[PDB]
Design a protein around this ligand. Sequence first.
Ligand SMILES: CCCCCCCCCCCCCCCCCC(=O)OC[C@H](COP(=O)([O-])OCC[N+](C)(C)C)OC(=O)CCCCCCCCCCCCCCCCC
Ligand code: SF4
Lengths: 70, 155, 83, 317, 115, 97, 114, 99, 173, 96
Amino acid sequence: MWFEILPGIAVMAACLFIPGMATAHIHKFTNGGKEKRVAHFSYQWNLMERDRCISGVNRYHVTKGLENID
Amino acid sequence: RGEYVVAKLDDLVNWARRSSLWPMTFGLACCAVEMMHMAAPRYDMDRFGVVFRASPRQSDVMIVAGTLTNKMAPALRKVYDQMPEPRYVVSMGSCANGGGYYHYSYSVVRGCDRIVPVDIYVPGCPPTAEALLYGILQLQRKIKREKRLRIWYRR
Amino acid sequence: AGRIASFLKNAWAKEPVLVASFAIGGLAIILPSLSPYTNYAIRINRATPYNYPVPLRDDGNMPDVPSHPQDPQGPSLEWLKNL
Amino acid sequence: FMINILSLIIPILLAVAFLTLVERKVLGYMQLRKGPNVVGPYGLLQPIADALKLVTKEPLRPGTSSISMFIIAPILGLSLALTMWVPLPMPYPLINMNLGVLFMLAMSSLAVYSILWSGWASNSKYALIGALRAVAQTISYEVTLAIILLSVLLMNGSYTLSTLITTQEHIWMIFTSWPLAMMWFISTLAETNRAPFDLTEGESELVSGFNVEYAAGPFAMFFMAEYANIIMMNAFTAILFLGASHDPHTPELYTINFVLKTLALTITFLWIRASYPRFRYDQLMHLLWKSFLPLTLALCMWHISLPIMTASIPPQS
Amino acid sequence: MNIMLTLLTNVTLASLLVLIAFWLPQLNAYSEKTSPYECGFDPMGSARLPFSMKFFLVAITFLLFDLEIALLLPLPWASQTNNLKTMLTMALFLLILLAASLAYEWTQKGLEWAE
Amino acid sequence: PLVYMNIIMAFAIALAGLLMYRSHLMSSLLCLEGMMLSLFIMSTLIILNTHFTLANMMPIILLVFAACEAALGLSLLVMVSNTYGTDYVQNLNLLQC
Amino acid sequence: PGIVELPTLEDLKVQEVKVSSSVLKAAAHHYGAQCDKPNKEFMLCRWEEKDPRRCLEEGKLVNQCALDFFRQIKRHCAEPFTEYWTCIDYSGLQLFRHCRKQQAKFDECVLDKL
Amino acid sequence: PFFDVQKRLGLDLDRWMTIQSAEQPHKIPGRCHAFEKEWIECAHGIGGIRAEKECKIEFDDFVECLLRQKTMKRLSAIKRQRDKLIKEGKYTPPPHHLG
Amino acid sequence: MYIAFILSTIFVIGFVGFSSKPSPIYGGLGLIVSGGVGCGIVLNFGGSFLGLMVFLIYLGGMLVVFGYTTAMATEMYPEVWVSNKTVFGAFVSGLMMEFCMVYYALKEEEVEIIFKFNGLGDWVIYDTGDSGFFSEEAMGIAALYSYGTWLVIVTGWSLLIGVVVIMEITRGN
Amino acid sequence: SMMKWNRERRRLQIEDFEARIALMPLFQAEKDRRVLQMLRENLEEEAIIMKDVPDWKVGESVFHTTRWVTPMMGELYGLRTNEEILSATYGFIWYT
Ligand SMILES: CCCCCCCCCCCCCCCCCC(=O)OC[C@H](COP(=O)([O-])OCC[N+](C)(C)C)OC(=O)CCCCCCCCCCCCCCCCC
Ligand code: SF4
């Protein structure tokens, strides 16, 4: 009756679920839809400061497109 | 009501206690091998929610199974005192209950109760695997019927 | 002939892992000499630009280097594009 | 931000707790027993029952023990196992980490130190011997684990755990380094201290190894620590070889695939636990230094010249 | 400081577990419970006497080998250089050097438990 | 800077610790081993500060031989512990003459 | 032990190109092709002079030339830029690979419109 | 070297590290490439003792660039006196220097 | 700034951990934690590879020294930092030793002991340069097999001589 | 399968690297202006702060030479706010 095994997995599998999409959802929430930008090198990290500075609200995850320039 | 609250926390405590108590891997004589007979898949020790741990710092209920001797006596009391509270003791078989078949023997102490406090006396010689598996059940009922933090509240 | 064949028989019979580990370790050393793609691996790392190639002042007579990153002249990498 | 931390820590503890149920139940079904089913439906309430009873059990402080040493080790064991869950490339890693495996490897070596210190801190034979068998166990697996780790990701490009998803992509990494996964899987078995290589515990040989004077809560943190360790390093071998596809628009699609990959692999860890006798730590360092080390060099030499062999050097970024 | 926050939280969460597992669940010690365990009997009296190794030879070789692997950790970055030719020979040279040292120890006894 | 001061006085007490034997050689041998940790941290501090790419070499290569010095060190202590039994430097004087 | 010289606060102010990084790298391939002459002039100054204070004029030229570049694309097909740069934004690594369809729509404006 | 075997056969053994402005992996510059360059090619073929008094200025500036202690001391004087009078009053921060 | 100086302060009294002769692994406790925070010092300056290396091989190296202590260098009553009076005196003398100068550095920033260095923290000493797409530390280490060459040979050959040396000295005929 | 994918992963990386060096002239033209603006900003502040000191040349040559040097960032963020210090000086390394 190994189908009695599955309830152990069912909660356990759901238990392993939470840190998966949450780490994606909080990243989505804190960065406004777009995913968490990663900076493994100076170029990427030097970018985030420029995006934080240009936005004028001190957030790197808000981007101004072609409407910003006139 | 305070008594209602203490009763609820009381219900939480014993349920964990009686569900998750861990018998000692202790065996002496004829009773020990029948004790592991019920641990075999026929009666399934573990399906009642218990698992065998070895050291005194590990287990909950001492399961004394076999003839108690004068030479065995100092270690049994030492190993029993070494188990942290709460701790329970059940006495397998006629021999460990008291005296047994060798009650009159020079090298047998007449009763494990003469050395260690006992909760339940499971009889039979050897007790059938059914009988002692009830003895665990009776201890679950006995663990259920306590008022440890309840007597403290009214203390 | 006979000695080596029996020796290989003995090694494959007693400790197959060691006569194995000597094999993968054995040819991994001599394949580089026989490798035809090592030159491409050399060209792989050279092609990858990390520092941006600062332009050069043109006082005349450098036909090889272009005046714009669109003229055909200059080092190219269509071998990678094919690859 | 801290909401992400609790959602990373709290589910692991419940997952670890429910590991004890399946440990006692699939083993039993794999053993003609029925497993714990008397506490709630099918025993799913048993992991809870274990937790409170262990916590409400009397903590014990042996007279000959070093009190500060006796307490720091259980903290180290549980904390490292829990903090081991932050850097994995689970679709959106909590901390991107250039040296993902080095962070993985460094504190995995520090994890055995909690295993190491508890033996003498308990001040007896049955724990000192178990502590010293931990020395020989980590003498064996550590000298080679870095070699397997280097070999598999040398085709990845760098030490970043996130790039593993990109590297695997089309096909399973095990298809390219299957003898390495043969090396890696059972060496993780040799570090998690499971049945074939659980000499640090040693049920039959020395009562309980580095646990004999431990009781109640210190065990509860120790029991969760090594159960957290096996699941995490199994999740490590899940991404190392069996990494699934990841769609940026639907990150949850990775979670469902990744969870089963580390779950079916976990069932294996419970699978070997039933069928195999115990390695004597004599042959444990003997085997991992007689056949394991000379072999793992050969594929390490194989796996370094071979990116140069076919002009398949992976990019670092 | 994100790694600091999870590190601080992790060691904190561990400390609560030991904190309420030492005060909440009662306290009753009467010496022999507090005594060391010797499978039921009283120990010979020590746990501090020299527990001399029988595998001391392999322990130091681990230090040499665990040290030398740190020399080849830079391998993934060492592959992406303009000079993979001498990179191949030098990196290979290290692996044969460890192989020779293991082979040297293997032949002159060594790894087998010293008696 | 102040970080440099903290880790050169790490040498000083390590220097004091090494050439001050109280009971046994193992503690001093460990102090010799840990003495290079300041040496590692010392050398590492200038090299990332000064951005000299090649000389990142020596912190690892100092680690090759400093721990190799320890490797023969505690293996020497094995030879003492068989003839001498203990590892006491006070007893370690059989060449009194 | 001498004098330091710094250009005053007036001549170091330009009409700064204010657009996010993702948009810049989305059009970087086209930006680097034609808008290159001020760029190539700028760091021949940077590498020959080895002094940023001697290359402000080239910095003005590249800033304004990029502004004309952004003026051209905004005027001809502003909308096809929108989906291309926003999907670059969604990529944490700003990967070009998950952009081919959107890149295609961008590519055929400037090839045929301009 | 006591025996400059390096120069005899002409093959380098350890000279690649030596000085800071040697060739670097894909040309990663050092902190003081300019200052160290000026000092090194100042005192080349001139003699060790015939290098201190003449090629001095290129050296203390280079060892300045390495440690930057006198400038950090310069920043110490700026910061110390800054906290001296702003606590007393007078100076109020301009709105770009504190956000 | 805190962490940069604070971690180095832990590196100091951590070094007092083993320089004061406790029981040998209590000294092992002393330098394993400073090795842990020593990773932090180089970490804040970048140095991730080197910081993880010490947190890799020290633990590997320190793994066996415990065994030798408990197997062939331990006593009937193991030492501790409070039991013996001299080691406690050694412990404390390692506490006011740096306490005076850090107060001297925090209050005057011009401490002259042996070397002359200012005390404006250490955030200043960092750089403004850009690494591009390559980490300086991780590539200088990777230059082992491209430009090390001879520097590689002397290290590898000595490791061979190492396993010979650690064998013959302990062989005992 | 690995060789084909690894070659492709490389092909994207040079494509990514091509974009990076295409954006270098604009970014370098911005950083030098940002750095030079702020160095003057410190100098303008330094004019009013240095009045009590007996001997102080305002903006004297730091070194004996007149060639420009990369600015020791202590001069850059020396008198800025604490958060701006941690955001850039310790920003990268502490960032995740
Ligand atoms: C294309 C050309 C180049 C090819 C290069 C690659 C090499 C190809 C040829 C060899 C391929 C295989 C190499 C590795 C072989 C396995 C390791 C080895 O040394 O084996 C022999 C070794 C040695 O066998 P032994 O210990 O019995 O000793 C045999 C006798 N002597 C020593 C003389 C040789 O096997 C072991 O060490 C046993 C390990 C047991 C581990 C625990 C029990 C098993 C648990 C269940 C595992 C089930 C599978 C799980 C898979 C998970 C995957 C994620
Ligand atoms: S009671 Fe009977 S079965 Fe049990 S030990 Fe005694 S003789 Fe044996």
